[PDB]
Chain A
Amino acid sequence: IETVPVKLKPGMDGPKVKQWPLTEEKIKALVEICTEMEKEGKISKIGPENPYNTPVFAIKKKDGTKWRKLVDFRELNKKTQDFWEVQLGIPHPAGLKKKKSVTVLDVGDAYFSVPLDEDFRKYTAFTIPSINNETPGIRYQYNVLPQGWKGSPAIFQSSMTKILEPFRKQNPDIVIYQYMDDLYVGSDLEIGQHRTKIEELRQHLLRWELHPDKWTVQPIVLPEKDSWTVNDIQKLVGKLNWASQIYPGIKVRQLCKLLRGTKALTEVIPLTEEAELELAENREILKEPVHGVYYDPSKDLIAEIQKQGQGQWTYQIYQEPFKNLKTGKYARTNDVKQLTEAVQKITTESIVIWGKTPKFKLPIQKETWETWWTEYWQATWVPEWEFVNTPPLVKLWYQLEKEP
């Protein structure tokens, strides 16, 4: 079968991304995988006149602990975004977020047998590095649609629906959504009947879980105290004052009114009636779904994460600062372990609800993250990410979120 032509935008150059250094055990694992992929025609060795490059990694498989190859096409995906979103975009069903159970299925090997436009193959170049720069570096390029390129599901889309039209008529209230190399299968059935309803699909493809409505935003719960000190009120005011950037009806005027004069931090302050009322109004604003926050499809999603201690992490998903479309907590290892699981959890939620992955703001140094993230990565996509500090008030605020 012939290939769909693909082109970068006229000013665009191909990806020239530097390969991060790999451990010897991952280099050896990648040499095996690639010589097997070459023996099957899926990749070919390339010469030095190809200047492009994309990073390659080794991650462990979901099922087995055998090694798996991850090519980080984030840069190529950005450079081909007209192709895989406008020209051949895949629509996202708003019903998927409402199923009781959603299953994730790996349909990655489907692309292995569709050829890639010859004029585009040079842009898929990657390099298996060597220890200590002792040998030049083994260069390949793709002959078939690559896993991890967002062009692959778009190109394979008309083939994909033809495979699924039978299963969709038979089961007409099951939603199938595909994002990159994954199938998201949503059903309101119960668990035992759901797991059989996917095996019928797992056989239909072979011939050729998530609980979204359990995802629930928790309210902020303020301290309840029988006796308030100056210190307690000062701490509460700093948090509520900051939080008014989220909830504009929050007020601290009556609480600040109680802190008259140069008081000792442990002095007890009885709450006047005006104070108790401001506080009670504040509690009500907080245990009510925030308003004026609505998803904008023309904007990037952003996920921020705070380290809370004792293996606890809070996160927010937003597009404009303080306008959180979603917030939550992730509970338990090491920091990088937990942080990589949080990122994959949040990205999966974000794929189901909006069909996009968010750009992550991570509270870790870049170089530590780049050294260790593949030690626990199991996904086939890689979200964009950057590295930030955490302001103390941010952490202190989302620490108040009610535990589920």
Chain B
Amino acid sequence: PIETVPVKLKPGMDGPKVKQWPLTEEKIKALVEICTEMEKEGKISKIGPENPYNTPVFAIKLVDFRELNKKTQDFWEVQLGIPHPAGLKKKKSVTVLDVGDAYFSVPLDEDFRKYTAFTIPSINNETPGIRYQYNVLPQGWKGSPAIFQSSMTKILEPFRKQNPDIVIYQYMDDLYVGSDLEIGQHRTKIEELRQHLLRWGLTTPDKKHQKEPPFLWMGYELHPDKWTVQPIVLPEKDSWTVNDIQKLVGKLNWASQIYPGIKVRQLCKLLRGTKALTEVIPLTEEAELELAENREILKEPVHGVYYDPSKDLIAEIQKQGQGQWTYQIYQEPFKNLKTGKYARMRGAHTNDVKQLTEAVQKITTESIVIWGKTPKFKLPIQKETWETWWTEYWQATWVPEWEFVNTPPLVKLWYQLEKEPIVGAETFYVDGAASRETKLGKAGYVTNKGRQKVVTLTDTTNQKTELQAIHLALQDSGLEVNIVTDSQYALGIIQAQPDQSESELVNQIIEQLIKKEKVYLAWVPAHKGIGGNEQVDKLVSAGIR
């Protein structure tokens, strides 16, 4: 017989004492019939005054154990993550058995039973009602899934040992059973499995009632030799609400695991800020373009293949621009196991080599989850671009196995700063200042050749003025220039050569630096009496401090 699992309430807690509300004569009639039958089968038992607990009958799971569940101890949680289909192996024959009487077949710990008490009220509600408690795992009780799965694992272990070659995956009340046997020998094994389970009282569909593939599971459609997602319909609307757009991003994110090149960043931008769910939101033309491409991606049918453990995994990444990356994992060319995307959701000034390295880290982690090993990468970046960036960067990384692949847009460093000051080039000392109160600011430079400039800005910050000041020095200098700033912020943005970001000032600066042929950029501490820095500081802080 199946042995009970000892289960305790959380420290310091008693069981539920929730009052049962009255019900219509029709509800009581149906409950009495259901419970009379459950009592005959031994799943519940009548109780009396010795039990002080109660839980309401479920009002449209026979009983609503939300309170018992809060008071019940925690469990090691069962099926935390789901398998991803791309991690499964190809099989000749596949079967799914739904276990009919799963919870009813597992006894509940004897001293825990009293906490599951519930009452069918009388119709008059002037006379006491019929009280019961559970003898088996109740539907809806926090513990039933973990205890049932643990019982099913012990039951399956003898069978797995005699049948090493048969894959059994347990998922809720279902068993998925895969083999490489021809269908006749598979069905012989299925029936032996059914017999094994029946010795413990577990009932399953017979051959005439077993479903045939493909199997619908967790939104996937599983074939013996491939998987896909069930169809994906994007509504066509002239006007979009916030809630409509949220629905899109979820469908598109769900599609991106098998449909390559999906992009969502322009639709995500439209969800920032306050917004009631009903508010109609006007679609940007960038949103409209990206929605357009996604519609064209989803017109064509796709499928994923399963994992051949004897071949290397290969991951290939493409830049889609504006901080978006897309990837494909395969073992044989043009047969994707899965796809995905990677986006830096914060609008930071991340460098392209660095964004690519995070995509790699995201894919490496996902690949260890699904296949237990890391792939070989094919990256749109030359080995020397990668080497110069990372040996010049303060942060450590490590991508063990990758190779260049010439599919544009390639990742490349757009400019290189000098490591030594340029002889004969003008030295600019730049500076900025702003007031927090008024958002009024100034930016400017002074020069060793005697030149100087100050510009006044509105709706600005200390940070933008320091960038504005560097903008000015770049704009008004020759093709060779030395620049001295006291902002390590502005210097770090420039040394960490950003991709095209959201800030139009930063893009302008990056444009100016491409066209230059020698730029040396240097940092000095503020307020130390350093010449040049001192003169420009007096200039830009005049109408500000």
Contacts and interface: CB of A to CB of B under 8 A. Distances in A.
Interface of A: 21-25, 27, 47-51, 53, 125, 127, 131-137, 139, 229, 231, 234-235, 237-238, 241-242, 252-253, 256-257, 259-267, 306-307, 309-310, 334-337, 339, 362-365, 367-368, 371-372, 389-392, 395
Contacts of B82: 133
B398 A237 contact: no
Interface of B: 5-8, 73-76, 78-84, 87-88, 146-147, 149-150, 153, 169-170, 358, 361, 364-365, 368-374, 391, 394-398, 400, 420-423, 426-427, 429, 446-448, 482, 484, 488, 492, 520, 522-525, 528-532, 535
A256 B530 contact: yes
A51 B73 contact: yes
Task: Report the 7 A-B pairs with minimum CB-CB distance, sorted nearest first.
Answer: A24-B372, A132-B87, A335-B396, A265-B421, A51-B74, A48-B146, A131-B372
A132 B372 contact: yes
Nearest to B429: A262
B528 A252 contact: yes
B427 A238 contact: no
B397 A368 contact: yes
A391 B489 CA distance: 11
A235 B447 CA distance: 19
A108 B446 CA distance: 68
Contact of B394 (A134, A136, A307): A307
B76 A48 contact: yes
A47 B150 contact: yes
Nearest to A257: B529
Given A48-B76, A263-B532, A371 B397 contact: no
Contact of B75 (A23, A24, A49, A391): A49
A265 B427 contact: yes
A335 B390 CA distance: 10
Contact of B398 (A27, A133, A252, A368): A368
Given A364-B396, A368-B397, A48 B524 contact: no
A368 B448 contact: no
A395 B495 CA distance: 15
Contacts of B88: 132, 134
A371 B365 contact: yes
A368 B395 CA distance: 11
Given A135-B169, A265-B482, 6 more contacts: A22-B372, A136-B149, A257-B529, A266-B421, A334-B398, A372-B398
Contact of A262 (B8, B87, B373, B532): B532
A395 B482 CA distance: 23
Contacts of A125: 76
A321 to B, nearest CB: 18
A237 B530 contact: yes
Given A132-B370, A265-B484, A48 B147 contact: yes
Q: Which of A49, A252, A389 has the most CB of B within 10 A?
A: A49
Contact of B525 (A229, A238, A265, A395): A238
B397 A229 contact: no
A241 B528 contact: yes
Given A23-B368, A139-B76, A266-B423, A134 B528 contact: no
A51 B396 contact: no
A309 B522 CA distance: 20
Q: Which of B146, B372, B488 has the most CB of A within 10 A?
A: B372
Given A259-B531, A263-B532, A264-B427, A237 B525 contact: yes
Nearest to B451: A262
A309 B369 CA distance: 32
B421 A363 contact: no
Given A262-B531, A368-B361, A21 B369 contact: yes
A23 B373 contact: yes
Nearest to A239: B525
Q: Which of A134, A229, A337, A339 has the most CB of B within 10 A?
A: A134
A131 B395 contact: no
B524 A234 contact: yes
B149 to A, nearest CB: 6
Contacts of B446: 262
Contacts of B523: 238, 392
B76 A51 contact: yes
Q: Which of A47, A131, A265, A372 has the most CB of B within 10 A?
A: A265
B398 A363 contact: no
A22 to B, nearest CB: 7
Nearest to B354: A365
A392 B493 CA distance: 13
Q: Which of B147, B374, B523, B532 has the most CB of A within 10 A?
A: B532
A371 B87 CA distance: 19
Contacts of B76: 48-51, 53, 125, 127, 137, 139
A48 to B, nearest CB: 4
A129 B373 CA distance: 14
B529 A256 contact: yes
B6 to A, nearest CB: 6
A49 B400 CA distance: 40
Contacts of A395: 394
Contact of B396 (A27, A241, A339, A392): A339
Contacts of A334: 398, 400
A364 B397 CA distance: 6
Contacts of B6: 49
B524 A238 contact: yes
Contacts of B422: 265-266
Nearest to B529: A256
A307 B427 CA distance: 31
A260 B530 CA distance: 7
Contacts of B492: 392
B369 A132 contact: yes
Given A139-B76, A265-B427, A336 B530 contact: no
B397 A335 contact: yes
B395 A307 contact: yes
A325 to B, nearest CB: 24
A395 B400 CA distance: 26
A83 to B, nearest CB: 20
18 contacts: A22-B372, A23-B372, A133-B82, A134-B83, A134-B87, A134-B88, A231-B421, A256-B529, A261-B531, A261-B535, A262-B448, A263-B448, A266-B421, A267-B448, A337-B398, A362-B396, A364-B396, A390-B395
A131 B87 contact: yes
B7 A335 contact: no
